Design a protein around this ligand. Sequence first.
Ligand code: JL8
Length: 153
Amino acid sequence: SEDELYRQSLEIISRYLREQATGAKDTKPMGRSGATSRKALETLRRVGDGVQRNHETAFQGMLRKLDIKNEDDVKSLSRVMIHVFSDGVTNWGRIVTLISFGAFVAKHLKTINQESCIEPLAESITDVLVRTKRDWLVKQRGWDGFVEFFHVE
Ligand SMILES: CCc1sc2ncnc(O[C@H](Cc3ccccc3)C(=O)O)c2c1-c1ccc(O)c(Cl)c1C
């Protein structure tokens, strides 16, 4: 390990996807750099819930096409996310879209009773994000950049 950006990202994304899936806002110390992580999760809830509601029909359309029923379908989803997300341009708009669609897929995994796929989905989203966009995330100040961009405080 010794990759704080990856650790901080996995924690924010895992927590968001897990609470969207179940409705429960999980309690833990938020590791290192907790204030920023906390503000990032709060922001992600606001903006991510907005994306899912505003683009519900697009998201439902994509989910139907992907035909997700198991961990096998989640691995094939990560390859889709690399082509769609990584080949396209880089900004917080697309990063929130990616994470938001993750949360939408996580809600579906719970309703089809395959909630053991949620934590792997989270890891796969984090890996796509941090592995393909590392130098952009570092230049924008990571999750401090996120919080600053939405002018929250
Ligand atoms: C695997 C699906 C992914 S991962 C990802 N990561 C970042 N952006 C995405 O889409 C946006 C465009 C967008 C903004 C808001 C709602 C839906 C679309 C973009 O490419 O800029 C996507 C998409 C995606 C692409 C095309 C689509 O029709 C749908 Cl429904 C989605 C969910």
